[PDB]
Amino acid sequence: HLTPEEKSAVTALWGKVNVDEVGGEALGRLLVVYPWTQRFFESFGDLSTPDAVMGNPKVKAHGKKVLGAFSDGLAHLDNLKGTFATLSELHCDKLHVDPENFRLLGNVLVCVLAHHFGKEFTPPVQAAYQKVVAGVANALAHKYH
């Protein structure tokens, strides 16, 4: 669990985050750094180069959707499992997405936050976000069967 001081740190930093932009950046980097994750987006078009992926309008659009749901979750840190129950079921039953992808995205997101915030993304702040991305990934994986 996060300490009261960690929750405040998470919430404080997130208030400065442009969710749409970070979403496109995080999803795009996921597809570039771990190319096999492109397997779920064969309808998105050109993903043959880093720029082709990062600038792909469908990737940027989907990134908004993804981090948008992530952002809402940050407003319910005490009930991540309930918050992501319907999305968990959807990702398992309809999209067939291996939960490991959520973990990979979490790590990429941490890297993106560090890249954007620089020194402000202190070791303690990172530790707080590691608990957050882990919690979100576990919540999204909870309804798999």
Partner 1 sequence: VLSPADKTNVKAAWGKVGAHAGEYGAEALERMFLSFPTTKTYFPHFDLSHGSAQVKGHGKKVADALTNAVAHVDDMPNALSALSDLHAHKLRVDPVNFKLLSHCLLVTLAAHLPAEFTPAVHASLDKFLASVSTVLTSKYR
Ligand X SMILES: Cc1cc(C)cc(C(=O)N(C)[C@@H](Cc2ccc(-c3ccccc3)cc2)C(=O)N[C@H](Cc2c[nH]c3ccccc23)C(=O)O)c1
Measured CA to CA in angstroms, residue 5 lies from 1, 107, 110, 112, 136 at distances of 11, 22, 19, 22, 19
29, 112 Cβ separation under 8 angstroms: yes
* Interface region with ligand MH0, contact rule CB under 6 A, candidates 17-25, 47-55, 58-66, 119-127: 58-66
| Interaction between residue 117 and partner 1 (CB under 8 A) | yes
Look up residue 129 and give its DSSP letter: H
| Interaction between residue 11 and ligand X (CB under 6 A) | no
Whether residue 91 is annotated as binding a ligand: the answer is yes
Site residues for partner 1, 53-92, by CB under 8 A, read 53-54, 92
Min. distance of Cβ 127 from ligand MH0 in angstroms? 16
Measured CA to CA in angstroms, residue 12 lies from 72, 134, 135 at distances of 15, 19, 18
Instruction: Residue 76: name the closest of 132, 115, 6, 20 by CA.
Output: 132
| Interaction between residue 3 and ligand X (CB under 6 A) | yes
Structural tokens at position 133: 């991305």
Of 56, 83, 101, 107, which one interacts with ligand MH0 (CB under 6 A)? 101
Structural tokens at position 113: 């936050």
Whether residue 1 is annotated as binding a ligand: the answer is yes
Of 63, 70, 107, 125, which one interacts with ligand MH0 (CB under 6 A)? 70
Query: Residues marked as binding for heme b?
Result: 62, 91
- Interface contacts to ligand X, rule CB under 6 A: 1, 3, 138, 142
